[PDB]
Design an enzyme around this catalytic site. Structure first.
Site, short mmCIF file in Angstrom:
data_model
loop_
_atom_site.label_atom_id
_atom_site.label_comp_id
_atom_site.label_asym_id
_atom_site.label_seq_id
_atom_site.Cartn_x
_atom_site.Cartn_y
_atom_site.Cartn_z
N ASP A 9 1.01 -1.17 0.00
CA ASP A 9 0.22 -0.09 0.42
C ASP A 9 1.10 1.08 -0.17
O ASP A 9 2.28 1.01 0.18
CB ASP A 9 -0.85 0.19 0.95
CG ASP A 9 -1.87 0.99 1.69
OD1 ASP A 9 -2.58 1.08 2.62
OD2 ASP A 9 -1.95 2.40 0.09
N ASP A 11 1.03 4.94 0.69
CA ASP A 11 0.82 6.06 1.88
C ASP A 11 1.03 5.28 3.30
O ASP A 11 0.10 4.47 3.48
CB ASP A 11 -0.06 7.59 1.70
CG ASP A 11 0.06 8.04 3.14
OD1 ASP A 11 1.14 8.75 2.66
OD2 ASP A 11 0.34 8.11 4.13
#
EC number: 5.4.2.8
Length: 240
Positions: A9, A11
């Site tokens: 993923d 951020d």
């Protein structure tokens, strides 16, 4: 076991919240990519991803999936696109839009501004109140929706009048709630990785929002990390 892929993923997992990736981190991933392939997914856009992982991001990762794979990249080529009106169809978009518009107009509130309906590629961000509400306006409506639960009241009727359209609802934040086709969360990208011969598909990110589906989906070996330093500790533990 056999050919494998690591999906991260963006951020939080590969960078510090609201910041670009680290040199050390970057050099770590390119080093990891030497043996095992890598990919990234996130709800943000490519431009935002570029800010975090660099403008040449499509060259640093084997797969790049902004907008939860609704934008896919592999080896540097724009795999494909997909939006809510194409998948669901215009007349389907207007049925949902029309309804929400007329439904929303029938809700007296202490304040109303604009953007009662926001249109995202793969999700309709609604809201009986709007979206451009101020700082004080947002908190006001939020505290008001606390006891009132205006959103759950609408997110339920919609589920009815549209029961069966393969639509999933989602109430989040203080003023809006997202609408989108079934499975159009991070799990959407998995469709770009389940046919390239990977015996194992790792996922590194947030495992809980309630529960991140990609983290639980049967095709992935979930590994939730608390920050980029964790992503490395685990990748070091697992690989190399």
């Amino acid at each position: 076991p056999g050919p494998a892929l690591c999906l991260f993923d963006v951020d939080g997992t590969l960078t510090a919240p609201r910041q670009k990736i680290t040199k050390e981190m970057d050099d770590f991933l390119q080093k990891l990519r030497q043996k095992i392939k890598i990919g990234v997914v996130g709800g943000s856009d490519f431009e935002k991803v570029q800010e975090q992982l660099g403008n040449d991001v499509v060259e640093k990762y084997d797969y790049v999936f902004p907008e939860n794979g609704l934008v896919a990249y592999k080896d540097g080529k724009l795999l494909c696109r997909q939006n809510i009106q194409s998948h669901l169809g215009e007349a389907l978009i207007q049925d949902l839009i029309n309804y929400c518009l007329s439904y929303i107009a029938k809700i007296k509130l202490p304040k109303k501004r604009g953007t009662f309906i926001e249109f995202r590629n793969g999700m309709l961000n609604v809201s009986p109140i709007g979206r451009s509400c101020s700082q004080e306006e947002r908190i006001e409506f939020y505290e008001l929706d606390k006891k009132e639960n205006i959103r759950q009241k609408f997110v339920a009727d919609l589920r009815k009048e549209f029961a069966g359209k393969g639509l999933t609802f989602s109430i989040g934040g203080q003023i809006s709630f997202d609408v989108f086709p079934d499975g159009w969360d991070k799990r959407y990208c998995l469709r770009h990785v389940e046919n390239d011969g990977y015996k194992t598909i790792y996922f590194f990110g947030d495992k809980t929002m309630n529960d991140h589906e990609i983290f639980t989906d049967p095709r992935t070996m979930g590994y939730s990390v608390t920050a980029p330093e964790d992503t490395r500790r685990i990748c070091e533990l697992l690989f190399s």
